[PDB]
Assembly symmetry: C2
């Protein structure tokens, strides 16, 4: 059941996104082959309601296209180049569907922390469509963790697939962290590294919760935070972080 029972120390942030284009099959393959145990990727819907893997509202940063992804049909998305901005050898990469990403992730036996990143207002539809795909295609023997910054997304996730573990994403640790985690029924708090507080973290851990932090790309900082009780980091250079731990 709970993905947190299998939480590794290092999670590849948007796949192995330091050296391959974020949120692509390429970055998922790289994470898989680098021996990273879990990936994190972001999910939202295309204009025609299909779960796709992408971070920004707009297309221009990570593709050759322009406009709102939320307003763009999958068929149009699929002819954009989602890799060349990272490097020309990735020019065949496209925005993956959630289904496509699942196939690659499961090939390597990796866990998936799917960050629900719905278009604001489209939380219910985004979670519903993502849950449908996952219920029929995600392997029961691999860890699946939902997380979100978005309250409605977390409520919907619990409503539509309660057995799947949930993490609450924040930047700063809320003063009311306990009441929020209890209310949202989340087993983990995922925080921004700049807001790590060893004392608050110790209290959160004392209370039985996992604590994770993003996005850590410096080996020394990762090790510093693990020593202070951080359960996992999200990293763009996950192989480098793991090399540091294992040394």
């Amino acid at each position: 059941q709970s993905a947190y029972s299998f939480l590794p120390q290092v999670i590849a942030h948007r796949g192995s996104s330091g050296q391959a284009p974020e949120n692509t099959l390429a970055s998922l393959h790289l994470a898989g082959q680098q021996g990273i145990k879990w990936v994190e990727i972001d999910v939202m819907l295309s204009g025609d309601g299909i779960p796709v893997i992408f971070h920004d509202d707009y297309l221009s940063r990570t593709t050759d296209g322009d406009g709102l992804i939320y307003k763009t049909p999958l068929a149009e998305l699929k002819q954009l180049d989602a890799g060349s901005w990272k490097g020309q050898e990735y020019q065949q990469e496209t925005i993956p569907t959630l289904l496509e990403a699942i196939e690659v992730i499961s090939q390597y036996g990796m866990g998936l922390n799917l960050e629900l990143k719905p278009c604001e207002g489209l939380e219910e539809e985004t979670i519903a469509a993502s849950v449908e795909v996952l219920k029929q295609h995600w392997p029961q023997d691999l860890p699946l963790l939902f997380s979100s910054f978005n309250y409605f997304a977390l409520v919907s996730a619990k409503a539509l697939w309660p057995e799947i573990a949930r993490g609450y994403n924040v930047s700063a640790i809320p003063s009311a962290w306990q009441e929020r985690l209890e209310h949202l029924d989340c087993a983990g708090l995922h925080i921004h590294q700049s807001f790590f507080d060893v004392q608050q973290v110790s209290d959160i851990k004392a209370a039985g919760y996992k604590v994770l932090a993003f996005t850590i790309n410096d080996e020394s900082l990762a090790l510093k935070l693990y020593n202070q009780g951080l359960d996992a980091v999200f990293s763009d250079y996950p192989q480098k972080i793991q090399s540091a731990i294992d040394s």
Copy 2:
């Protein structure tokens, strides 16, 4: 007055002040909106590293200042050394990141209404709203409209908890299928949507149910006029004076 702000909603709101020409979210853009005769402004609020409400849009400093790093982790004294105008134009070189207090001073001078968008650091919603409410309860003129809005759930819950008499708007990109449930849940009197998600059928339903509908960010006067004709109550614009002129001259 400040309560029931939607009763005083103009058709045009200056998005981050008059931000097409002047640097967004500065005293300059607020003065420009005032001088252009715009009736309300919208500006974004969050806390400095030392807990002071400041007017700023991004998490990071580099887009609209010569600074670097997270505004949430930077003390006010350090923020005030930053140049928040040169990126827009050399004439704006002296502009700083305003405190909410400083912004209120300029806004009130022109007798403009304020739609304050609560943009707290995620997780710091309760502290951000508390700090902002303190400033406003002390300094916001009671005879000018004040509207809180946010994309953030906990921000809207905190606003109602700490100062229920001030009207609230729910910011989204798309109109939720459960818009009615949401607006009643959050106790909001208006829905603010992204222009690309304007849906005349849904908007008519929302209007008929007693809520205001606003859209951002519209800089094309022809589009603005079409949307008003289809029931939209207000636009947020970077060129609010141009939109107003289109409204006033339409035959």
